[PDB]
Amino acid sequence: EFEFPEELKTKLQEHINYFPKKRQAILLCLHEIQNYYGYIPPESLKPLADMLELPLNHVEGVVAFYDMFDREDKAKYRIRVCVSIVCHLMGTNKLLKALENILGIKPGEVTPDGKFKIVPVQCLGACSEAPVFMVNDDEYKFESEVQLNEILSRYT
Amino acid sequence: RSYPAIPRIYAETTLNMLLKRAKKPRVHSIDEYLKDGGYQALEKALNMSPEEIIDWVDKSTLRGRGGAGFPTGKKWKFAVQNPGPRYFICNADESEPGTFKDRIIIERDPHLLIEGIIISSYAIGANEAYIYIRGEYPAGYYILRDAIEEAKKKGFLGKNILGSGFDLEIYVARGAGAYICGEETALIESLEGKRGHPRLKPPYPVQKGLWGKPTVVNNVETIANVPFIISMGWEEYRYIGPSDYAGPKLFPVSGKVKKPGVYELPMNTTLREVIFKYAGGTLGNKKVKAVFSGALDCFSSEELDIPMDYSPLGFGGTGTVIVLTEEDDIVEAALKIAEFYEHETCGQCTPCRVGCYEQANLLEKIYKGEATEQDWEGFDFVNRNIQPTSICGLGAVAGRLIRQTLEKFPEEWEKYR
């Protein structure tokens, strides 16, 4: 039987009490779940539905719709790499190559230790600082491989 | 507290209004905001009637800064002719390619936005307001939560604000990866805990919105003007820039310019001035080939003398300026725009669903030199046929920029055939 660890359940419950209606907290809860597990575990969705007083199929549909959520791959750190127009113009491919040199992975893949997954994403709204990537919540301009290596070294 | 890392986007202003603080790349907390006379506009507003505030916002000529340019005061009037309760929504979904103007307000001067939201909510009689901020702006989310707590501490939010009898709470919701949730009806669906599927309009949100109640949706930048209108008065505000398109405007400039960043300028500024007078010209002093207005329009180098206003011949949109120079392949660029629409159609409408996909799928073939003659003809057809039956603006414009490239850069497309 799948139970959220208490410290997660507590945070989930905060979100659910935050808005006037419980069901408005669905995306905040899913973010929180993905933060905790490194992905959305399929088994988590049932208990969340119960707490939101929504049907399971409603919750499943919502996870499926929103691209930030990931049910496939557990990763400690998500390297979100912008593949949209400005970053493409200004050197997305140089960034992908640098990531491949440091980590040994391409977009869509996870390092064997489960530490890093590269996620290709649409415009991150930092186009003046292209090419842009995120490491979990942190966001950076890519300058060069030596610089990127130093940044990634901070994530342990 | 500690916020996630944010790149330090360059900001510059000739008007010292929206970017007075946000020209410096750091969070400005409530004490610094108060030192600059912050929240005095709210105090003044609470000593006015809602109707007066609406009237001032109307007479200011403020138009929506989220892309469509609808007159803000008029939108509010429509809402308030409908019975309450009413809701106020700040749209902070900003996810269009090239567009990064709203985030610098959120992340550097959150109290400007918050003050704007409080005044606007009071104006339309909303006691509950929302900021819907895209999921990929986590720092902006934490910064706003903290700033709202500051405002509460200082008595600018909660019940009976400053003895006025006006009650307000602002709730911060987060998106989770869908560009379509910036479309105001999909945004509302998301706030209601559902998939971001646009609703048939009309009815407009101001008639039937969140929980079916009158709802005003306004863009971050729109709302950030409201404190200035109240503080200066509508007449002084209308004295900024040209009298038919008055007020400050933020221009996010990216691509092949020397000084990419956000520029606060009057709307009589020309596109050429934005590029060459403010953004420092092009990288390598190469010639401008094209400017993409986000993912909406493509302007050629022959069209640089247009004003950055909401006129028929003007730039329009959100003032998003992506600069391409002479060596940039226009078909490669068009592919990136096609990929965006492919990734972001919600799929409710059939021509949008299949058209966004096929447009990207066939243009990839063209680009890679693997397109048959049928694929070429099919690409052309599909590009012209995304809009039919569409219920929102995405289907209406998914082919627009690409069509303009086909018309304005035929030689380059021809090379690929």
Ligand SMILES: Cc1cc2c(cc1C)N(C[C@H](O)[C@H](O)[C@H](O)COP(=O)(O)O)c1[nH]c(=O)[nH]c(=O)c1N2
């Ligand atoms: C596909 C799509 C996507 C978006 C939009 C439209 C469409 C069709 N709109 C415009 C939105 O629907 C609405 O017009 C504005 O939020 C209204 O506010 P203003 O009148 O511009 O202040 C929009 N607006 C905004 O403020 N932020 C955004 O990120 C988006 N995104």
Ligand code: SF4
């Ligand atoms: S036009 Fe496209 S994005 Fe808009 S509702 Fe229809 S399928 Fe969804």
Ligand code: FES
């Ligand atoms: S195109 Fe990459 S951040 Fe906008």
Ligand code: NA
């Ligand atoms: Na009224």
Ligand code: NA
């Ligand atoms: Na736009």
Ligand code: NA
């Ligand atoms: Na508090």
Ligand code: NA
């Ligand atoms: Na979103």
Ligand code: NA
């Ligand atoms: Na996306």
